[PDB]
Nucleic acid binder design. Sequence first.
DNA 1: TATGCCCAGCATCGTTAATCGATGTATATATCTGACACGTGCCTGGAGACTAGGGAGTAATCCCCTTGGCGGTTAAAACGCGGGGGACA
Length: 41
Amino acid sequence: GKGGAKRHRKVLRDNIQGITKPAIRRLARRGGVKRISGLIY
DNA sequence: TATGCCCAGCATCGTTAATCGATGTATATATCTGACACGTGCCTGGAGACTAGGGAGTAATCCCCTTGGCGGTTAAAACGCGGGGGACA
């Protein structure tokens, strides 16, 4: 349970976590559906 | 004359043996078809050989384009909350 010279570096440009979820919904409505499931996207 | 007694007489039942015919099983032979390999014959579409030429290889230079680093705002992604209306039975 220590500071231990901790350095934090994780990867969120390329990797799919990093990309933006609204970026998708932005996409979803152009099609014009009313609803987005969590599972689906 | 009628009623019990002697002497044949074919069909009743069963059992033995020979015979025509059906069923099962080899066993070497005469068709049936379907070939794949060979030689028959011929064509030339490939092989073989040579040339000539221009594509593509490489090498030597250039300079443009792509990646990088950085920092400021400023929108966007992210989160959550809440409740309605669509999914699903």
